[PDB]
Design a protein around this motif. Sequence first.
Motif, PDB file in Angstrom:
ATOM      1  N   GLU A 321      53.375  85.184  30.524  1.00 36.94           N
ATOM      2  CA  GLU A 321      53.945  84.138  29.662  1.00 36.94           C
ATOM      3  C   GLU A 321      54.891  84.733  28.647  1.00 36.94           C
ATOM      4  OE1 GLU A 321      53.768  81.028  30.208  1.00 36.94           O
ATOM      5  OE2 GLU A 321      52.149  80.910  31.647  1.00 36.94           O
ATOM      6  N   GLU A 322      56.182  84.387  28.736  1.00 38.00           N
ATOM      7  CA  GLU A 322      57.219  84.937  27.851  1.00 38.00           C
ATOM      8  C   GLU A 322      57.723  83.885  26.868  1.00 38.00           C
ATOM      9  OE1 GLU A 322      59.651  88.250  29.972  1.00 38.00           O
ATOM     10  OE2 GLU A 322      59.485  86.765  31.567  1.00 38.00           O
ATOM     11  N   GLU A 323      58.237  84.338  25.704  1.00 44.39           N
ATOM     12  CA  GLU A 323      58.790  83.446  24.691  1.00 44.39           C
ATOM     13  C   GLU A 323      59.961  82.610  25.226  1.00 44.39           C
ATOM     14  OE1 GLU A 323      57.863  82.755  21.857  1.00 44.39           O
ATOM     15  OE2 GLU A 323      57.100  84.463  20.717  1.00 44.39           O
ATOM     16  N   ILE A 324      60.168  81.431  24.608  1.00 51.47           N
ATOM     17  CA  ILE A 324      61.414  80.645  24.729  1.00 51.47           C
ATOM     18  C   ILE A 324      62.140  80.834  23.408  1.00 51.47           C
ATOM     19  CG2 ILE A 324      62.588  78.431  25.186  1.00 51.47           C
ATOM     20  CD1 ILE A 324      59.726  77.459  26.360  1.00 51.47           C
ATOM     21  N   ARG A 325      62.912  81.890  23.341  1.00 51.68           N
ATOM     22  CA  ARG A 325      63.661  82.221  22.131  1.00 51.68           C
ATOM     23  C   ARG A 325      65.006  81.500  22.089  1.00 51.68           C
ATOM     24  NH1 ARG A 325      67.545  85.415  20.115  1.00 51.68           N
ATOM     25  NH2 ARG A 325      67.287  85.809  17.855  1.00 51.68           N
ATOM     26  N   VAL A 326      65.366  81.028  20.912  1.00 51.00           N
ATOM     27  CA  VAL A 326      66.638  80.350  20.747  1.00 51.00           C
ATOM     28  C   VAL A 326      67.419  81.082  19.648  1.00 51.00           C
ATOM     29  CG1 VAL A 326      67.722  78.148  20.240  1.00 51.00           C
ATOM     30  CG2 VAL A 326      65.580  78.171  21.558  1.00 51.00           C
ATOM     31  N   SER A 327      68.548  81.695  19.978  1.00 48.92           N
ATOM     32  CA  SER A 327      69.295  82.508  19.010  1.00 48.92           C
ATOM     33  C   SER A 327      69.792  81.625  17.880  1.00 48.92           C
ATOM     34  CB  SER A 327      70.458  83.135  19.765  1.00 48.92           C
ATOM     35  OG  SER A 327      71.319  83.815  18.840  1.00 48.92           O
ATOM     36  N   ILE A 328      69.981  82.220  16.691  1.00 45.25           N
ATOM     37  CA  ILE A 328      70.632  81.501  15.581  1.00 45.25           C
ATOM     38  C   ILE A 328      72.151  81.322  15.825  1.00 45.25           C
ATOM     39  CG2 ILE A 328      68.775  82.150  13.965  1.00 45.25           C
ATOM     40  N   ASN A 329      72.724  82.100  16.749  1.00 47.68           N
ATOM     41  CA  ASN A 329      74.134  82.033  17.137  1.00 47.68           C
ATOM     42  C   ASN A 329      74.303  81.405  18.515  1.00 47.68           C
ATOM     43  OD1 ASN A 329      75.172  83.722  14.850  1.00 47.68           O
ATOM     44  ND2 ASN A 329      73.717  85.169  15.786  1.00 47.68           N
ATOM     45  N   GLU A 330      75.307  80.541  18.648  1.00 42.57           N
ATOM     46  CA  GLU A 330      75.592  79.912  19.938  1.00 42.57           C
ATOM     47  C   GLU A 330      76.119  80.936  20.939  1.00 42.57           C
ATOM     48  OE1 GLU A 330      78.958  77.119  20.403  1.00 42.57           O
ATOM     49  OE2 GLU A 330      77.635  75.803  21.484  1.00 42.57           O
ATOM     50  N   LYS A 331      75.536  80.981  22.139  1.00 43.15           N
ATOM     51  CA  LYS A 331      76.005  81.874  23.189  1.00 43.15           C
ATOM     52  C   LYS A 331      76.701  81.091  24.297  1.00 43.15           C
ATOM     53  CE  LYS A 331      73.525  84.919  21.092  1.00 43.15           C
ATOM     54  NZ  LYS A 331      74.141  85.944  20.208  1.00 43.15           N
ATOM     55  N   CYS A 332      77.822  81.633  24.775  1.00 38.45           N
ATOM     56  CA  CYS A 332      78.503  81.100  25.961  1.00 38.45           C
ATOM     57  C   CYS A 332      78.804  79.600  25.847  1.00 38.45           C
ATOM     58  CB  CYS A 332      77.679  81.359  27.242  1.00 38.45           C
ATOM     59  SG  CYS A 332      77.041  83.031  27.419  1.00 38.45           S
ATOM     60  N   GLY A 333      79.159  79.160  24.634  1.00 38.68           N
ATOM     61  CA  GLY A 333      79.439  77.745  24.430  1.00 38.68           C
ATOM     62  C   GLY A 333      80.541  77.233  25.333  1.00 38.68           C
ATOM     63  N   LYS A 334      81.630  77.989  25.444  1.00 36.89           N
ATOM     64  CA  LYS A 334      82.770  77.544  26.234  1.00 36.89           C
ATOM     65  C   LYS A 334      82.391  77.343  27.700  1.00 36.89           C
ATOM     66  CE  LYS A 334      86.786  76.980  25.824  1.00 36.89           C
ATOM     67  NZ  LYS A 334      87.529  75.667  25.925  1.00 36.89           N
ATOM     68  N   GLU A 335      81.669  78.307  28.288  1.00 35.99           N
ATOM     69  CA  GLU A 335      81.357  78.228  29.720  1.00 35.99           C
ATOM     70  C   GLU A 335      80.536  77.001  30.064  1.00 35.99           C
ATOM     71  OE1 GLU A 335      81.301  81.001  27.785  1.00 35.99           O
ATOM     72  OE2 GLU A 335      82.521  82.409  28.988  1.00 35.99           O
ATOM     73  N   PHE A 336      79.693  76.555  29.136  1.00 32.84           N
ATOM     74  CA  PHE A 336      78.751  75.487  29.415  1.00 32.84           C
ATOM     75  C   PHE A 336      79.086  74.191  28.677  1.00 32.84           C
ATOM     76  CE2 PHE A 336      76.723  79.519  30.391  1.00 32.84           C
ATOM     77  CZ  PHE A 336      76.346  79.292  31.722  1.00 32.84           C
TER      78      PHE A 336
END
Length: 339
Positions: A321-336
């Motif tokens: 069981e691994e964490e569901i981490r959410v960064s404080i910085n947006e990643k890959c916004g443009k691609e998605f």
Amino acid sequence: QESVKEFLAKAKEEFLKKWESPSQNTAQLDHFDRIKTLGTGSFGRVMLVKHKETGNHYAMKILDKQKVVKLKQIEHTLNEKRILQAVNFPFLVKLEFSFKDNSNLYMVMEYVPGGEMFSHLRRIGRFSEPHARFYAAQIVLTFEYLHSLDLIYRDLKPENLLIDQQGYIQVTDFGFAKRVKGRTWTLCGTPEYLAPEIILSKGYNKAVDWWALGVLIYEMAAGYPPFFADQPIQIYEKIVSGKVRFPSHFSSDLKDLLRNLLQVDLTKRFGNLKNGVNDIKNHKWFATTDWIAIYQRKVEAPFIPKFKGPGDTSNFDDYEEEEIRVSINEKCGKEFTEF
Ligand SMILES: COC(=O)c1coc([C@@H](CO)NC(=O)C(C)(C)C)n1
């Protein structure tokens, strides 16, 4: 048959309306409790979750945006969500919500508690021909639906067929599905199920799904796939030779169907001829199948999976069981952007 034609014309209209205006951003992570990891891969995982207000269970697929980018799955992940939010068929797992955050993409699907066909097949060894035929008929109807929408599925294998509470199939994992009016070129799919034209790097079409159906029917009825070998290179050599050996317990009708689905020349393959899917539906191996009754879910299934309720995970297996981490910085916004 005009009734089938009119059904498929309506199906395509309804698909196109959702395809052209996709839903977005219809839930958020903190509306759910995480329960258990049900599967995990190189860029994604599926977790059982519970909605905190309704108590409903769902299977939430979580894709790490950075890993999707690194493994060259951007377009495939956008295909998967855009297709799943637009389709509607009895034998497809339903996408209930989708959303994204700084780190991940999320597809919240209905949870099918009976497990993968793969587990059940490997437990029992092989299915009888009636049992294999019940599942095969559902795949035939599902591919008739998808292909009429110009969709190619490209990931048929026993792990992607979930068994529901009535013993019917729900196809899951649209990660390789694509809207294709003509040909496409990407190398994707599990080795045992790849059509020769994929192995040979050709521009290929929906006929690859009908080849994969042949592999699936063979594996259901034999207990092992037709081109089995220890390593992919050897599997690929067997596929492109297309030499197949059938168990003597196979019926003559089954062997005839499989020779026409496992036809190396895609221009001669059942499902890809002038009569399309009707060469398959009208084949003698399917003579006992009432296609309408299967679609309406009126046939008693061969097998009802054992499970205790909509939260029971006992037919799936155990993962770290691994964490569901959410960064404080947006990643890959443009691609998605469009997700
Ligand atoms: C409705 O239930 C599901 O959609 C459901 C349950 O478990 C799964 C698991 C194992 O099959 N799949 C994965 O984790 C993958 C990472 C996509 C392979 N999907």
